[PDB]
Symmetry: D2
Subunit: 308 residues, 4 copies
Amino acid sequence: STQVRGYDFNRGVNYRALLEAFGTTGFQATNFGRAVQQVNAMIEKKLEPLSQDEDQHADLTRPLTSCTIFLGYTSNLISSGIRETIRYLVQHNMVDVLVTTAGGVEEDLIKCLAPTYLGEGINRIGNLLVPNENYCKFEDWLMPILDQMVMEQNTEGVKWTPSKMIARLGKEINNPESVYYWAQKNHIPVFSPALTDGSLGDMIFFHSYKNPGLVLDIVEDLRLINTQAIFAKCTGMIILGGGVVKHHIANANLMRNGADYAVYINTAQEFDGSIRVDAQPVKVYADASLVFPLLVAETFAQKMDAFM
Amino acid sequence: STQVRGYDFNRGVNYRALLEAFGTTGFQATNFGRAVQQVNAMIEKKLEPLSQDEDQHADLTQSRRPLTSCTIFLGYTSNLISSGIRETIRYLVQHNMVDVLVTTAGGVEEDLIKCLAPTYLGEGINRIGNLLVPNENYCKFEDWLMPILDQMVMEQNTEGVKWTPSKMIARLGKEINNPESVYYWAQKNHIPVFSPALTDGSLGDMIFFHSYKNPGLVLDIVEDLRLINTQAIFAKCTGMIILGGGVVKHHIANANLMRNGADYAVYINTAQEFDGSKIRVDAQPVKVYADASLVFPLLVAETFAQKMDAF
Amino acid sequence: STQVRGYDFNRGVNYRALLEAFGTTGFQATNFGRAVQQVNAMIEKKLEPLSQDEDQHADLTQSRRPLTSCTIFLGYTSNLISSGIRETIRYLVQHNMVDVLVTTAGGVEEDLIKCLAPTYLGEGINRIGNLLVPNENYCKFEDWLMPILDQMVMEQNTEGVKWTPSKMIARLGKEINNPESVYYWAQKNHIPVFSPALTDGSLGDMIFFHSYKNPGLVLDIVEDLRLINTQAIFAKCTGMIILGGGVVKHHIANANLMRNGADYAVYINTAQEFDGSWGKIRVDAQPVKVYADASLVFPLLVAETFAQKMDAFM
Amino acid sequence: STQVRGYDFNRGVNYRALLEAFGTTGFQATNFGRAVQQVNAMIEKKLEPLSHADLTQSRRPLTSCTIFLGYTSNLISSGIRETIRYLVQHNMVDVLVTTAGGVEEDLIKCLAPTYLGEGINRIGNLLVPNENYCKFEDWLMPILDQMVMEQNTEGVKWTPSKMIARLGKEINNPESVYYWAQKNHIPVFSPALTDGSLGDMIFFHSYKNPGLVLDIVEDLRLINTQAIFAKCTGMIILGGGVVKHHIANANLMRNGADYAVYINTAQEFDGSQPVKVYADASLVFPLLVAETFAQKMDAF
Ligand SMILES: CC(C)C[C@H](CN)n1ccc2c(-c3cccnc3)cccc2c1=O
Ligand SMILES: CC(C)C[C@H](CN)n1ccc2c(-c3cccnc3)cccc2c1=O
Ligand SMILES: CC(C)C[C@H](CN)n1ccc2c(-c3cccnc3)cccc2c1=O
Ligand SMILES: CC(C)C[C@H](CN)n1ccc2c(-c3cccnc3)cccc2c1=O
């Protein structure tokens, strides 16, 4: 059994030892240390070379690795500075699939046009402020792209889905601060059935009266996200801010393995009800704005050289 | 200014007086009393007669549902459909007391599955909090669903049907043909159901599996985007009752869309604010910080169920 | 196995059937139904006829309260006394439906102050969640309190009184002499009130100020430690109803003290577990926890339990 | 206005820059950055040279900022016990306040360890073997005998703070928070001292050796004189509302806190300017100390 012991500041400030001491500190500090262990296990799996046999399985679809990592996050984390943390992972191909919620696409693209501010015509998101002007700049940028998307649908047989639209918006924003710029550049698909539930939806709706008939099919994206999970050698999940992806994915009939590694960081409670098996997930009960940068510092950022 | 005073049990037990006394009890009891007041205000607005030969904008809404003086949006998380709140929601939909439903992944199939086999109390099983759904329930559902999915794909070819989540949910409600089903009553009463996340759970696993046996099903979210927005834009007045989480974010006022803010908005959930989880403005919402499994039946008893005669 | 089924409003509004249907609704509704079952079992145990040597228990407990077949401890946070749940608690104490009260800093003075001036709904003021207590209410209480503290110090110094929080709370309840007061009824019915944190808030500010005018008041917690323990040790059976937080931690079973675990334990609060917040001794029964604001749940619980057995307490 | 921007890991892992970037990250990360600013302001005030003992009835010399450190007992069961012990060891705080269990869980750890989980006492994901309490009871009983004798023969008027100082002196172990508090004349307040296991043992002891008195009114005067004679007041309150923020009282000559940080996961909705970080203090408090007190070790 491991004894409870906190970091001793009589040693001075050794940041690596202080962060490792979370594991023996207890409560959510211990969950954080278990999350670091799970994510380091994911990364070490991902960096294992595929055999010529495994490599063959992999190509039945970006290059397959030994661990396909799904990174799911709520839109609020894109409004926060965690946008930079996510952009870094996507930029360096450290994760394979993104899943987000309503607002999670446009809040990244808008930040390329105008900043979000700290608080305590304004959109308030917790202690953040997005001036209404930011949405106006975004709408002016978006409308011509929606025109091209409808023309391509009608003249070049394009069958749009949320993931194909998000790839197109990332290509158009053409800005290395953008999560979605890097995802499309690095062939990391982005899934968001809720893509139209917020401001981007208001704009697509408005656009549809002057230029009707845009179709966004969710069933083709249903097949694409499943293909990422079914053809994976191994599956990891890092899910932030809420239940963006429920942990139970193991499905014998679909040939879909459970995740070998799963980390959840959120402040949701269980009490109101909010093939390889599904591994026991690690849950850190904490604001991901605090915890996710610390997790990335102790895991992905330690293996930067291997992803360059 | 209103004095804090709880119900006096020396009066014995008058449930109406006990429930009204929540308003002066404080903390979330007071919020419950304010939620009762807001929903009763919504209902009284809805029951106001609408102006003579009123422009329906049936051509603008593409809906067969007649306009009332207050369009009520009822949003709820799937977990509430697994709970007994399924019965509470089914009652409101059955009596045309709400106009639009919005739900999350699982919120459709957990209602339909309960028509085939029961969900059980806990403490091959799917655990949802203290509830248990036997895996066999999903097997029965899949056997029932596959032939309907076949008909839906063929109707794209034979009838020019352009499926959306709302149109699929109405079809599944018609097929289940069971008056215990929320979705049976919604399609019978022309109450549309919106759920872009329709395919994110077990129903999605089945649609995915079916799509290799019978390819072609398209579910378009943009036509549903237009349908849900036109319900809010052509509303004379808007009410929102949102349960279990942020199924719908409160700020809907949009001058460019001529979309009024809600005049009345009630939220019942246990989510925290601290981690960030011309047109009429968005009225200040009432939030009751509580499990909707406790609060929603009490809310309905003191509001909709009091005005059953008018519906 | 019990099927999940909510109340069907097609039956109309039958409040008793609606409240019973919480049991089959799931999530915290089911926990509420379990809490009603546990409290009804506590009350039915309490109402079972006893035989016992009255003088004998009295000399061991140093209490005038007669033993029943179940000793019920009611614990609550001070915020619930600021709320309308003050009326709910006062009712239970008035009718001798509970045996012992335990509260936290503020839980005594917020009841006494309401006898002098009202607390108001919000959304010089003390804000307690969405409640407002005007600062003037505390000034009226201070004016009322100072002469009583003078008498308490005189009785200590001339009549050998050894003050404890429970003895002080009984004296304040006697002095307020107002049937709206929880503490008026507790002292009238010989229900002791325990609060080691009695002086951590406004009442403490006033005791502190008074000690400059009239020094040497002693409030001993060790004699109260013995009084609360003897209530639990000489209990035939123990129930706990704990509101608003962990006012009393549920594990009380102690072989060395001959202190039985609770046979029935109900907790109503919104606290989380995640941040760490010989067949002769009865075990600690598994508690029922309802994750809910007690301001909503406690009156419903009382309606379906204690209020149904009012006849047996007359 | 400050722009929202997270730490860019393209810059590599620079821990000081990463921790500062919490300030511009938003949500509770921003609150953490504000908490570091408030505590650094407290420390800078405390280290200002000053231009009392008969008024406070304390041997502790006044500084330019009196810091009250309040914490729930669960944090003493956690590894935050080490973080608290460090601050007390180096006289970086002036007054401790805790809740039921917060004294004995420090002393018991000097006799036997607490273990990680997921005859055992469970405290969240921590395990305290029942034998730990048995070793503590064996150690405690002789001290209680001496305390009652000193009361009855040497006129000692015990209070929770005087008992906690005595237990810290007796444990005589530099891993103990309460050892360092009594060594450094840092008083510890706990009216709830007897609500838990230590109370069970004092109660048991009272049968064979009756009449121990623990007075709370003398402690009421001692904690107030710490606040009244303060030039400036800082509060660091962990795990819950151990001390409510509003202390300003004109009639008592008691100033409000100039600086206040609260770290806990309590919600305001059921009725349970300071900086509040809504977070488990087991995660946040070591980071806060690393960027504040530990940076100024030389000055202490
Ligand atoms: C993780 C997935 C491979 C499996 C899992 C099965 N429950 N699953 C599927 C889709 C899925 C989607 C989705 C659906 C359709 C189109 N675009 C995205 C979105 C969010 C979560 C999931 C999700 O959790
Ligand atoms: C409530 C709505 C009238 C406006 C509001 C604007 N933020 N809005 C829009 C769509 C919407 C949708 C949606 C989108 C597309 C297809 N089916 C459903 C789903 C959930 C929430 C919203 C939602 O909150
Ligand atoms: C409930 C009790 C019989 C036993 C239990 C043992 N853990 N216990 C004891 C005292 C106790 C007290 C107390 C202490 C001293 C004076 N006045 C009140 C206060 C709050 C909780 C408890 C409490 O939880
Ligand atoms: C911080 C204090 C100077 C003033 C403040 C006024 N509300 N105050 C007082 C006592 C106090 C005590 C206390 C009381 C008596 C004996 N031992 C400790 C415990 C906890 C918090 C407080 C507390 O918050």
